[PDB]
Structure 1
Amino acid sequence: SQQVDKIKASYPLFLDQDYKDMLAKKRDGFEEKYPQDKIDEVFQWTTTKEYQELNFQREALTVNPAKACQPLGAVLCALGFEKTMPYVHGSQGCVAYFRSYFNRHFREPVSCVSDSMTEDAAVFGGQQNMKDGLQNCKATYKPDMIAVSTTCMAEVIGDDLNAFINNSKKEGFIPDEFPVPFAHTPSFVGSHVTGWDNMFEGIARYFTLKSMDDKVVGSNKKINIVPGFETYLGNFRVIKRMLSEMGVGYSLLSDPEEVLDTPADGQFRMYAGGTTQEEMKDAPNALNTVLLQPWHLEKTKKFVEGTWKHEVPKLNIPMGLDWTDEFLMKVSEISGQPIPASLTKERGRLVDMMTDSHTWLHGKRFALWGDPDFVMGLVKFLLELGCEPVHILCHNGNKRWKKAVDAILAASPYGKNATVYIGKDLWHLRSLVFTDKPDFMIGNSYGKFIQRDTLHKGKEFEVPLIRIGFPIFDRHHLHRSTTLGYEGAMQILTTLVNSILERLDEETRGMQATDYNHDLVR
């Protein structure tokens, strides 16, 4: 029942005796559920080393993946351009989840459309859904540019995005100079990050392929910056900030940092800021092009080096003390601008922090996961701190990567018990955390469960999840965080050490038992 004065929602409503006795009948009565004692048996089993072996032998089954499809990234990428409307050529149901997914992660409006292809097009493709589609979209949300991607269907029945687009122009459905870049993004190939790679590349071409004649490397004194698939606003920013603080002229290619944080002033903006088209057109004239998240921008580096003729450097995602140094340096080298006292200090401080609290981080086993660059940068940093990244998983990674990581691990005493896994999912990780238990998990919300499980086995077995990554739904505004650069390092370092201390408090809060180690000063 309810006390109008103190209303209870789903929880703890159903803890009320009646609801208790309610569900109890329903169970015994019609569920025909396995005797508890069995469930307890089976469970315990899954937390064993034996189950692991059986688990790792999976070939066809995938339980709780840790990657999304290409289009998801093609969409995000496209959002980084002035008045650009992400257009996904395929079934409409897909776009639904896309927006729906990002919204939950950004708590902002994700604008994206679909030319709602149906069954009646699985035979003759959608040369029409394109025609009408492009017209409808352009006249309704009046964008300056429309980037086209594809869904599972679209690719299987195979439609030529280029052709279809060229006809929609020819047949007069949309102007002939209206920017409509495109890229094929098969769900069944690589992860979402791959989409971004493609998409971006697709746009790069559309503005620089048919016009490399009047272009001359270095003519603008700027450096192009390609962020790749980034979901932490604070990053885009810190990059801009650091560079601007360095006096470096830059051109961030694909900047969604504005449409993902439109302010609440009474009016809805479907578009905001973003990489202008001219910026793209001119890009070729940039001194060079740096890739923030290289490990998933190969199709771009190729094009960039191949066409624009830039000497893209061999840089790692700028995370942690070390790499970020290298980044700043290489940037200097290129630009010819000295590293300002400002940053020399920010750094110094990041180090202060490190020394200020290593004692707590030292020898702390972590199990983590995410995307290639992200993951390896996180790994690199944990090592710079003196932790032992024991379970580095990365569902969408590849062999070449796995090697680079092992190389990073092998170069540090703190990497002895480190193991890298690719192709494996969160159900695998679930086991790795039971058998070879770490102290925390650094990953996305999908990991909230793994925690629950570790607890079901027991308090002493629970492994606290530390949300850092994508996607994040059970917490708010973390997407405003920052992981790149020194600013980032600091945040993470704090989110860590404190997560640790946070838990040590919980373990010593027991009155007259363990509360003796419940020190005030730590």
Structure 2
Amino acid sequence: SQQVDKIKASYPLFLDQDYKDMLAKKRDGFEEKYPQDKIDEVFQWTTTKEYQELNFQREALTVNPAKACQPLGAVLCALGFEKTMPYVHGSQGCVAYYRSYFNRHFREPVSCVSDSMTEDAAVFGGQQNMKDGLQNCKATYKPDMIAVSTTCMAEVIGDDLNAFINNSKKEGFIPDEFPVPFAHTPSFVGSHVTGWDNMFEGIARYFTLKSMDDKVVGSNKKINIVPGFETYLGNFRVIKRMLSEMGVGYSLLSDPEEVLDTPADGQFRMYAGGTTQEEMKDAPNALNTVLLQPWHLEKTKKFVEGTWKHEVPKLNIPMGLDWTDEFLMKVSEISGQPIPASLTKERGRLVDMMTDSHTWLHGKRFALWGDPDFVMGLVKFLLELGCEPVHILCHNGNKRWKKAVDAILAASPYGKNATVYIGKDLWHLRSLVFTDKPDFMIGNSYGKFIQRDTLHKGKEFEVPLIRIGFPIFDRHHLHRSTTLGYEGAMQILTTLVNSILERLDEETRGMQATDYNHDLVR
């Protein structure tokens, strides 16, 4: 039933007695459910060290992964280029998923096409799909560039992207001069970040490989910035803001911040902003190329060093205090620009906030996950805050990266109780937060189910989630945030200390029981 002036959605509608009785009858009648005592027994078992040991013995089964597949990153990379249509050669179901995944994180349109290869292509290949697909895409959506990647079906069948695109131009389906950079992006290799690396390197090759003869390193007095797979609008913006404040000439290579934030003003803009083709063509003339997320830009690095002859600086992601300092000092060295008073003052405002909040942050224990560069920068900043990053999980991490993070941990007393995990998933992490309980999780929306599980054991065992990462689907507009630079460090610090204080308020809100410590001032 409903009361017209107080309509109930599913929650709390289904808590009405009649729905409750109906659901109990469905269970008892037809579901052959295990008895509640048995469910409780098995749940308790899943929180134990014994279960954790079985859990960590898994070899073949993955449960609740913390990564996606290559083409997702290729799509995000391509979206950062001016009037560029991401085009995934292969099966169309993949493209529905990439678009929806990004739709839900950015709350924005996400344009991408497929060429709709079907079972028949397993006999004759996808060449005709490429010819008609490129022609149809160009005519219908009028991009100035189509950036081609692949789904796993096309990789297994073995379609030669280079040959198919060349023949599409030869046979007149698209103009010869029309830019169609490409990359093979097999989902069974690496993860979404690898697809970003592959797509970027393909676009870089497209515009520079056969024209290096006239290039002179440093001739355009700019620094190239490669952001990698990046899903916070504030991160593209803070980098451009800081370089502009220093008077540093730069080219942000893959810049989707406009197309992922168009105004609702009465018209839909399929394309906005982005890196220009000319910026890619001119990129070898820069002083140098800086990679903001080097641990998933290894192929790009080899190309800019091997072909453009740039000496890519050895810089960590500019997260936290030390690594933002290092980023700006290296940029100052390359460019000849001093670090200006505005950034020096911003830096000292961050340090001030650290002194202001250090007593509530000190010793706080965290489990956290994400992509390798994000994760290591979060670990570094936590150490700088006097926090303990106890469970550090990077599903798509590698041994060399883990050694780097273990070195960072070993250089700080706040790393003494921390372990770095690679190849492990959120079912692994769930075990760790039961057996070695931290104070909070820093992670993406999939962490909400871990928090749910911990609360089920009891309120004293609940581990609250702090949402920093990708994807975030169950809160609105956090994709506008910043995590890089001093600005992002300030935002992270604020979110962390206030999550601590919100939870303390919750635990001290009990009248006469715990509210002796429900202080007005903290």
Cα deviation code 1:391-436 (max 9, x no counterpart): 0000000000000000000000000011000000000000000000
Written as runs of structure 1 = structure 2, the 5 A alignment for 1:74-473 is: 74-473=74-473
**Partner of 1:50: helix, strand, or coil?**
helix
RMSD of Structure 2 on Structure 1 (CA): 0.3
Cα deviation code 1:330-349 (max 9, x no counterpart): 00000000000100000000
Deviation of 1:124 after TM superposition, in Å, equals: 1.6
Deviation of 1:514 after TM superposition, in Å, equals: 0.2
Cα deviation code 1:413-470 (max 9, x no counterpart): 0000110000000000000000000000000000000000000000000000000000
**Partner of 1:229: helix, strand, or coil?**
coil
**CA–CA distance in structure 2, aligned partners of residues 158 and 350 of structure 1:** 52
**CA–CA distance in structure 1, aligned partners of residues 299 and 226 of structure 2:** 12
Cα deviation code 1:376-404 (max 9, x no counterpart): 00000000000000000000000000000
The normalised TM-score by structure 1 is: 1.00
**CA–CA distance in structure 2, aligned partners of residues 168 and 405 of structure 1:** 46
**Structure-2 residue corresponding to 1:45:** 45
**CA–CA distance in structure 2, aligned partners of residues 115 and 262 of structure 1:** 27
Deviation of 1:143 after TM superposition, in Å, equals: 0.3
Cα deviation code 1:89-122 (max 9, x no counterpart): 0100000000000000000000000000000111
**CA–CA distance in structure 1, aligned partners of residues 327 and 221 of structure 2:** 18
Structure 1 unmatched runs, 5+: none
**CA–CA distance in structure 1, aligned partners of residues 123 and 513 of structure 2:** 72
**Partner of 1:98: helix, strand, or coil?**
helix
**CA–CA distance in structure 2, aligned partners of residues 4 and 258 of structure 1:** 43
**CA–CA distance in structure 1, aligned partners of residues 228 and 379 of structure 2:** 19
Deviation of 1:156 after TM superposition, in Å, equals: 0.6
Deviation of 1:172 after TM superposition, in Å, equals: 0.6
Identity %: 100
Structure 2 unmatched runs, 5+: none
**CA–CA distance in structure 2, aligned partners of residues 201 and 192 of structure 1:** 15
**Structure-2 residue corresponding to 1:495:** 495
**CA–CA distance in structure 2, aligned partners of residues 401 and 321 of structure 1:** 21
**Partner of 1:357: helix, strand, or coil?**
helix
Cα deviation code 1:154-186 (max 9, x no counterpart): 101111000000000001100001000000000
**CA–CA distance in structure 1, aligned partners of residues 395 and 159 of structure 2:** 29
Deviation of 1:123 after TM superposition, in Å, equals: 1.8
**CA–CA distance in structure 1, aligned partners of residues 122 and 267 of structure 2:** 40
Deviation of 1:268 after TM superposition, in Å, equals: 0.3
Cα deviation code 1:161-220 (max 9, x no counterpart): 000000000011000010000000000000100000000000000000000011000001
Cα deviation code 1:210-239 (max 9, x no counterpart): 000110000011000000000000000000
**CA–CA distance in structure 1, aligned partners of residues 67 and 417 of structure 2:** 25
Deviation of 1:475 after TM superposition, in Å, equals: 0.0
Deviation of 1:125 after TM superposition, in Å, equals: 1.3
Deviation of 1:13 after TM superposition, in Å, equals: 0.2
**Partner of 2:389: helix, strand, or coil?**
strand
**CA–CA distance in structure 1, aligned partners of residues 67 and 448 of structure 2:** 16
**Partner of 1:438: helix, strand, or coil?**
coil
**CA–CA distance in structure 2, aligned partners of residues 264 and 483 of structure 1:** 26
**CA–CA distance in structure 2, aligned partners of residues 142 and 15 of structure 1:** 52
**CA–CA distance in structure 1, aligned partners of residues 72 and 388 of structure 2:** 32
**CA–CA distance in structure 2, aligned partners of residues 196 and 89 of structure 1:** 16
